[PDB]
RNA sequence: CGAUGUCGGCUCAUCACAUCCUGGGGCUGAAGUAGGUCCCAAGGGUAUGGCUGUUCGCCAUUUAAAGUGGUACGCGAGCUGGGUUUAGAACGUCGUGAGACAGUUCGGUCCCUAUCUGCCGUGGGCGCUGGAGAACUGAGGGGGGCUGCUCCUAGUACGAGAGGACCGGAGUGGACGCAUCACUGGUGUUCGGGUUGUCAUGCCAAUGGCACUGCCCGGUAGCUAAAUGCGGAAGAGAUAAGUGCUGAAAGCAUCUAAGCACGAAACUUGCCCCGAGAUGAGUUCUCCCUGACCCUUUAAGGGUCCUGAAGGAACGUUGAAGACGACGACGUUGAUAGGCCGGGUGUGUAAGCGCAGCGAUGCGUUGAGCUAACCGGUACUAAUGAACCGUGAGGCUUAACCU
RNA sequence: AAUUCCUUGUCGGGUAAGUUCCGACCUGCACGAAUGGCGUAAUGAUGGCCAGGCUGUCUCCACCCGAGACUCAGUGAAAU
RNA sequence: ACACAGGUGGUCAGGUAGAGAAUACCAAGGCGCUUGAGAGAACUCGGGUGAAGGAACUAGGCAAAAUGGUGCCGUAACUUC
RNA sequence: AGGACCGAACCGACUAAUGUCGAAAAAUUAGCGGAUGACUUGUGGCUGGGGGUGAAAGGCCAAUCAAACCGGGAGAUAGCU
């Protein structure tokens, strides 16, 4: 409908950086620690992108200290602040759910460098 | 109701009595015959024998 | 009919 | 409860259903008018119209995508040469349904499904 | 499944009271030929809305 | 989602390795726990140098879930393995002096201060 | 006060500045003009019946056309009626906009539920499905026992069994208001409301104040 | 005894209070908390695992609680068959023996397509009387009514200290039920891609058929929760237990005999739903019908011509409505269904061509191609002009009103 | 113990918790040496228990594909 | 007892892949199994998948799920070797 | 060489489901055990009813077995319905 599209397009931000799934994407997200407002960092590998317009989201899989940490992020949410692509991954599949079982040497992928 | 076998009797039944004596903690289990009363008398005789044995054992230890 | 079968056993109830 | 679903099952599995839609679409392209039941014609409206839509523009790869369906060279030969430049002006809706009584074998709703043709 | 007793002729009639078929009684007249046909159906000779739609 | 008969890894260095969740504590007829709820566990495997032995039945707190915990912005945080921190049954006060792996922000409430104080990430 | 008739057009979410994203439903509100004001002198109760939308001038019948020409307003789809609360009085033909929702904080939405059809016992009354193995024959999703024995000799009235699910007139109560838009003629409500996209919704003020 | 299937288990429950908790109170050998006992109150809730076929019991851990019983110790034309009681075989005992053992253990086919009442729903005819389209009021009936933890009050009262209130308010939880895909998932054999074995298109390439959708990987819309909100109330009337005021019988005393004011999740409302078949058939608005005659048992009678009115019905397009009926939208004065254009989403650099490499293969055109059930438009196709049912203003009596 | 009534006799192990199981204690109602006893490699659609993987068995079911069940056309029963 | 998903001895017997008369697709050859058309409700059967747990379900790992082939390394208690 | 191992034809039915007025008065589906011998099967004979036969269940003896079927004593008898 035009009503739903008009209500969504007035809220979507117009400075979304375009990135393919597989890129080493570092996202800085706001967090409220009570009386503090800190911009924290989260650097990992994007394994899924669900485009839904305003409802769009993207996963950033990170291998932290110990086991892996998978965390989704809404694109047009005010809680996130910056999205910076570090490396350009050259996978040929939209979803990268097979990387969950792979740890260590088998987790890395190809660089585009086109 | 009782465990074991051979009759419906068993099924509609009860015919199994457990009596616990509270200040000592003595449990007497009787599943012998078909009737409760003839097991009631056996359960009270076993209660009397076990209480008398537990008291005389404490007296002989003292 | 020429052949009437044996009926179906019943509940045990023995 | 099939809320907002499409696609008629027609009491057949997807293999036989796709195969008979293939054969019936080929027969409708070859003969330009056929007589069948009514829901088969209703679903064949969703089969023949994408074939003509693919047959709107003649090229190299469009012949291979029109050969991927209907599995025949004479059907794709009648496509892109005879139906293509004749249905060029009209945009969509190239078919026509005619309800024609009932069949005497099983009392099913009969229908002539045809194209907008036969002015030869 | 197995009944206690049989129903009546009256019970059978009150059951078959809703089994009465309904005729359409709405046969149309063609514009050109005037033959009898049903709603949204072609005639025996293929007439529909005056135009020869079957061409056969 | 931590329910009965669930095997969990131990987050701190208290000594146990594999534990089994036997009951989700808090509220009757409860299916599964949440972000930082108290569960009751038994110990199935431990190290020789642990402060607790194999077979001790004690209370623990879930810190990482494979089902995922939901921040109120609309996002979810899914971990690649279930994890718990062992607690001493009347006052929580966790046994391990070092804790491996990150925790969730909703655990930080008035009683788990030592866990998020020893947390290396988040 | 009175409630208003609106149309459900999808669901969205509102991102607040602090971080919490609230799921909202977009209820559009057209000009709910008054068709008739019923008084106690002829009915014994004071109320107003209104309409919404806009019909074409081929579908509306001559009784409905005369009933609409009695008020003189434009023909719209449906008719609803709201009881008055003794503190106000409306005239015939007053265009009631969404501005009555600017003061209230919580609303109650009544809508036609989405029809699930002839559903079973497990889907309707949330019964536990029996064990699908260990000798189970022909008794997977059946309700099982529906009555006791000879001494009742019947099934009790009100028994939770399989049947019609959906197409009801259910009411999700105590829904928070989010934004009252007058230019787009919208009414964002918090949470989910009964009905699909395009169904009628009676949005009344909260009786549980 | 010309047949009533019994135990235990799973699902589904119903009712009584001799009440397990929640609620209102009295006594206490009740300083507070935590208690013991008793009364009223059935509105709601009333465990999870090991053993045993076991009901029961013990243990471990919760809970506010792990209530007692009836309903053929509820429920096998709802389900197993572990145990008890068919046919085989053994251990111990008795009997010379065949055989027997409420002494076990091993294993052993549990039928039925619903005629009637009942229940869950959903329809047709007729009625309410001139008919129809709607809108409701509302008799009556149904759904729900559980509460933990933390904080303020407040470390306050109480208490030598330790410990620790009543009442009131707020937040966050568990279960239940309802609603919906806005988020996260599952399915998505109608969408895309990778690949194995074979066959076909005369062959390469490419594609299709089969082998459980071949194996899988995701994934559009719908359905679904594990996902997200909502609610149990606040308030009023009449009360049970109980606490009372005035107050004689009976100079006192007395909650009662006259009366009055309190007093619970129990009763009726108040929250929501069905509902005028409530044959007691309700109320309001609107639309439509104002043409002649004979026969006569001059009866609320029958028959003929002309007209068919509002409206309904039939057919088609169909639906987040639906077993079938029924309900909703539309029928050319059109956006109801199918098709088409664009966008969105999903799979992921189609085919062909060109270049590098002996080759598999890699790169550019290209983040292309294909898109189902989605959105916004577009009559391109199909919903034809019409025929069918339903009528000439509507009975008797009485009163008030205008003539 | 295929033996055992009392009995779920007693100790230890396995499990958080084990009337089952294992190794014993002998108080053998009513084991016992060819109507054979005690062990025994391998074997068994054998009885029981435990450990790992694995999963809709379950927690708690949800969706989809075909065959019926629903409707129409034709033929058309049965128990009672 | 039927134009019945049962049983009936011997001979010939190919292409690809395969250890193989197994199994997958085909040649020669025979057939589509004497009720169809709709809609895609509850319920029943054969199945497929599934977030998190992995037997907590049940008398009982019953049923389902899982392993599965060739070459090589290595293989414990006990034993009649 | 093996009353050897896995696994087709073949033999039999151990579990669960479908049926249970069934496709059929014992079957089918998905898993099974043996499958070079104490194996299976065709053809033709022999053993028979107080008997035959039995790797032994009191099983089988033409869908009927702790004494088959057919015909006759016999219209047995029945204090029983």
From Swiss-Prot, chain B:
Protein role: Peptide chain release factor 1 directs the termination of translation in response to the peptide chain termination codons UAG and UAA.
Span of the signal peptide: none
Residues forming coiled coils: none
Family: Belongs to the prokaryotic/mitochondrial release factor family.
Protein name, UniProt field: Peptide chain release factor RF1
Location of this chain's protein in the cell: Cytoplasm
Modifications after synthesis and translation: Methylated by PrmC. Methylation increases the termination efficiency of RF1.
Gene transcribed to yield this protein: prfA
Residues bearing PTM N5-methylglutamine: 8
Residues of the full protein shown: 228 to 289 of 360
UniProtKB/Swiss-Prot annotation, chain D:
Molecular-function GO terms, alphabetical: structural constituent of ribosome
Gene Ontology biological process terms, A to Z: cytoplasmic translation; ribosomal large subunit assembly
GO cellular component entries: cytoplasm; cytosol; cytosolic large ribosomal subunit
Keyword Cell membrane tagged: no
Key words, A-Z: Ribonucleoprotein, Ribosomal protein
SUPFAM superfamilies cross-referenced by the UniProt entry: Prokaryotic ribosomal protein L17
InterPro entries: Ribosomal_bL17 (IPR000456), Ribosomal_bL17_CS (IPR047859), Ribosomal_bL17_sf (IPR036373)
PROSITE patterns xref list: RIBOSOMAL_L17
Subunit structure: Part of the 50S ribosomal subunit. Contacts protein L32.
Role this protein plays: Requires L15 for assembly into the 50S subunit.
Family: Belongs to the bacterial ribosomal protein bL17 family.
The name this protein goes by in its record: Large ribosomal subunit protein bL17
From Swiss-Prot, chain E:
Superkingdom, natural source: Bacteria
The keyword Ribonucleoprotein is assigned to this record: yes
Signal peptide: none
SUPFAM superfamilies: Zn-binding ribosomal proteins (SSF57829)
UniProt keyword list: Ribonucleoprotein, Ribosomal protein
Disordered: annotated span: 1-37
Name of this protein: Large ribosomal subunit protein bL32
Family annotation (Pfam families): Ribosomal_L32p (PF01783)
Annotated family: Belongs to the bacterial ribosomal protein bL32 family.
Species in which this protein is naturally found: Escherichia coli (strain K12)
UniProtKB/Swiss-Prot annotation, chain G:
Recorded GO CC terms: cytoplasm; cytosol; cytosolic large ribosomal subunit
Superkingdom of source: Bacteria
InterPro entries, sorted: Ribosomal_uL3 (IPR000597), Ribosomal_uL3_bac/org-type (IPR019927), Ribosomal_uL3_CS (IPR019926), Transl_B-barrel_sf (IPR009000)
PROSITE patterns associated with the record: RIBOSOMAL_L3
Free-text description of this protein's post-translational modifications in UniProt: Methylated by PrmB.
Alphabetized GO MF terms: rRNA binding; structural constituent of ribosome
GO biological process, one term: ribosomal large subunit assembly
Modified residues (N5-methylglutamine): 150
Keywords (A to Z) from UniProt: Methylation, Ribonucleoprotein, Ribosomal protein, RNA-binding, rRNA-binding
N6-succinyllysine modifications at: 38
Subunit structure: Part of the 50S ribosomal subunit. Forms a cluster with proteins L14 and L19. In pull-down experiments interacts with CedA.
Purpose of the protein: One of two assembly initiator proteins, it binds directly near the 3'-end of the 23S rRNA, where it nucleates assembly of the 50S subunit.
PANTHER family per record: 50S RIBOSOMAL PROTEIN L3, LARGE RIBOSOMAL SUBUNIT PROTEIN UL3C
NCBIfam families: L3_bact
Stated family: Belongs to the universal ribosomal protein uL3 family.
Protein name: Large ribosomal subunit protein uL3
Lineage per the UniProt record: Bacteria, Pseudomonadati, Pseudomonadota, Gammaproteobacteria, Enterobacterales
Gene for this chain: rplC
